[PDB]
Amino acid sequence: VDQATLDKLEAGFKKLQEASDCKSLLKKHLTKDVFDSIKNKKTGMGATLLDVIQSGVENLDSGVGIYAPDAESYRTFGPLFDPIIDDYHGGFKLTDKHPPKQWGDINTLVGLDPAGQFIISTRVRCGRSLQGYPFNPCLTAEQYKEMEEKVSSTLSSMEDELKGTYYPLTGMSKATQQQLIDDHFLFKEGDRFLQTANACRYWPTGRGIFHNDAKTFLVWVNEEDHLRIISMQKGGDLKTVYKRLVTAVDNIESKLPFSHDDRFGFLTFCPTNLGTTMRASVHIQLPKLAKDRKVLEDIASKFNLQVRGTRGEHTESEGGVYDISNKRRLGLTEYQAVREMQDGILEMIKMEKAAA
Numbered sequence: 001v002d003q004a005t006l007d008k009l010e011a012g013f014k015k016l017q018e019a020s021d022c023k024s025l026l027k028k029h030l031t032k033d034v035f036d037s038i039k040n041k042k043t044g045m046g047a048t049l050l051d052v053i054q055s056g057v058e059n060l061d062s063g064v065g066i067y068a069p070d071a072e073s074y075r076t077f078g079p080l081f082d083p084i085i086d087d088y089h090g091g092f093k094l095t096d097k098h099p100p101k102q103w104g105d106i107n108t109l110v111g112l113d114p115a116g117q118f119i120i121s122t123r124v125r126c127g128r129s130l131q132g133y134p135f136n137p138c139l140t141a142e143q144y145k146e147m148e149e150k151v152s153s154t155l156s157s158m159e160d161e162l163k164g165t166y167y168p169l170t171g172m173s174k175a176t177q178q179q180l181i182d183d184h185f186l187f188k189e190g191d192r193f194l195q196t197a198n199a200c201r202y203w204p205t206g207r208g209i210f211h212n213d214a215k216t217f218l219v220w221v222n223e224e225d226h227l228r229i230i231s232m233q234k235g236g237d238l239k240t241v242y243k244r245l246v247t248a249v250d251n252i253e254s255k256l257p258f259s260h261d262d263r264f265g266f267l268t269f270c271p272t273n274l275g276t277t278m279r280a281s282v283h284i285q286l287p288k289l290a291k292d293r294k295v296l297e298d299i300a301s302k303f304n305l306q307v308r309g310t311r312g313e314h315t316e317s318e319g320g321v322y323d324i325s326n327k328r329r330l331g332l333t334e335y336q337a338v339r340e341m342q343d344g345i346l347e348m349i350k351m352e353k354a355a356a
């Protein structure tokens, strides 16, 4: 590791120390001992600790604050990643292994709010990384383009309900782009946490969205992860939303090779997305429980649920609409993760109905 990087790491560490209002997992778990023992380490593709922690040093309002520039990073900087992963996913020890993929009995899932008084829309997504490619900070412009061609060619063979069109961001009109974002379909541009992780280079080259005509099945290409695979619709019919996702993923997995680790499950750029990579969410109004956003969050956390704003993480609630989803993704099966969202949302609705 070059001396300029060391200097920057030292001031970075000093900055986290003196930030008493910082509550990130990075601040919590990067101790002097941990720091000294990995700060001189470098991965096979030359990623350093600075590449891992820069986002969380620059954005002190980070909740987690680290990313993995390449797959090797998860082991090379294991003394930092391991306790943060344990913490975030609710108990995952050095001796633990993520279980094999298991979608489970789809017929056991239920509709979430048949009267339709609380849930606006239901969404399940997964992420995948292509074998043979590093994560965002180590990609070249040529590689973004290569992966885009591979992925869009594969998706053009989708059939029936999953049949659709790939739309590159390159050449998309500002009007279409902004409309897709406002309608909750397309990822937003210019996320500061991603940008400071060097994860947005060469933007918009290689970035785009595939969707069917109904926009109930969507694929994001080269945003945070190589692929995000999304199923969504209005209402709370979780069984239909999940079924569609399962069908799409199993179909795509038979055509593309995805990185899967014996311990961590499916590999992703952020440690919060490891394992099942699954985030099942509702957009929901809870007039009585959400009177205080802080009380909503305390209830939700007892159900291992996370609260986000209307336009995604790091945004505010607009019109009392929250995004509520399973927090944990690693150390439990796909079926378990979606059940944690299902069960928790059912109970929160019961509490809202009973509340005075």
Ligand SMILES: Nc1ncnc2c1ncn2[C@@H]1O[C@H](COP(=O)(O)OP(=O)(O)O)[C@@H](O)[C@H]1O
Binding pocket: 121, 122, 123, 125, 181, 183, 184, 185, 186, 187, 232, 279, 281, 282, 283, 308, 310, 311, 312, 313, 323
């Ligand atoms: N249940 C939902 N219904 C409609 N839109 C949703 C739902 N959950 C998330 N979204 C939208 O997904 C987009 C991405 O949000 P973000 O928090 O980055 O989630 P992720 O990247 O995990 O999919 C945002 O436009 C957000 O409003």
Ligand SMILES: NC(=[NH2+])NCCC[C@H](N)C(=O)O
Binding pocket: 024, 055, 056, 061, 062, 063, 064, 065, 066, 193, 224, 270, 272, 273, 313
């Ligand atoms: N898109 C995600 N991976 N979100 C979870 C981490 C987001 C951001 N890096 C933080 O520490 O707050």
Ligand SMILES: [Mg+2]
Binding pocket: 224, 312
């Ligand atoms: Mg996102």
